[PDB]
Amino acid sequence: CTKSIPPICTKSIPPI
């Protein structure tokens, strides 16, 4: 996920 609020995450594992 990105350093934002709400952070947005891809459907990856571990997600980023």
Which residue bears the tokens 């459907």? 11
> Solved how?
NMR
Q: Is the CB of residue 15 less than 8 Å from the CB of residue 9? A: yes
Length of the chain: 16
Q: What string of H, E and C letters represents the secondary structure of 1-16? A: CCCCCCCCCCCCCCCC
Which residue bears the tokens 């947005």? 8
- 13 Rama sector, left if φ>0, alpha if ψ -120 to 50, beta otherwise: beta
What's the CA angle centered on 3, arms 5 and 6, to 5 degrees?
20
Cα torsion 12, 7, 3, 14 to 10°: value is: -20
**Would you call 1 exposed, middle or buried from its count of C-beta atoms within 10 A (0-12, 13-18, 19+)?**
exposed
